[PDB]
Amino acid sequence: ELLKPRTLADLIRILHELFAGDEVNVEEVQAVLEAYESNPAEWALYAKFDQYRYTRNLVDQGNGKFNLMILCWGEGHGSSIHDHTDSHCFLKLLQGNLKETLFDWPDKKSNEMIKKSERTLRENQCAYINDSIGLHRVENVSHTEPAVSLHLYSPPFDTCHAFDQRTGHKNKVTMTFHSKFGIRTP
């Protein structure tokens, strides 16, 4: 029985129920994430920005089944084209807008990675991606509005690959958390 999360804490409790087992009902997780109405007071603790690039702020470790984090994107901040390390990845906008550009997996031959499509994710919308679907880049293209997004990855992962748009070549990157449970972790 999927009920509307009343608060971020309620959403976290519901997610612990949806990940109690070994598999993931993607549509139900996406539905509950989308149904939570962003309330800035509830996540202010995690909204720690950096002037130079987006930050990753861990909110919950999902009893080992998933990492729930909040990403804070300053104006013009964006990610690399990347994969998701054989994990499910849900992205819900809490504030602002983000541009998501989708790319297919490159072939072994060096070549320009041409985008398949792009879309604007708006406040409260939840997107989903996994390696079977493809790769993506996420960017806050706004010149005046910082963006904040809520991400859930299952299983949790600490590394992924960044892809060079000019060649398709990839390199392993290790993800680092700017804060954990509201505490800056330098």
- Residue ranges for the known binding site for Fe cation are 82, 84, 136
Q: Name the token pair of 122.
A: 């708006």
Q: What angle do CA 138, 20, 177 make, to 5 degrees?
A: 35
Measured CA to CA, the distance from residue 101 to residue 116 in angstroms comes to 8
Q: By the 8 A CB rule, do 143 and 75 touch?
A: yes
Q: Name the token pair of 5.
A: 């999360």
Question: How many other β-carbons are positioned within 10 Å of the β-carbon of residue 55?
Answer: 23
Give the phi and the psi of residue 183 in degrees, each rounded to 5. -105, 125
Q: Which residues are annotated as a binding site?
A: 82, 84, 136
Q: What angle do CA 152, 156, 161 make, to 5 degrees?
A: 95
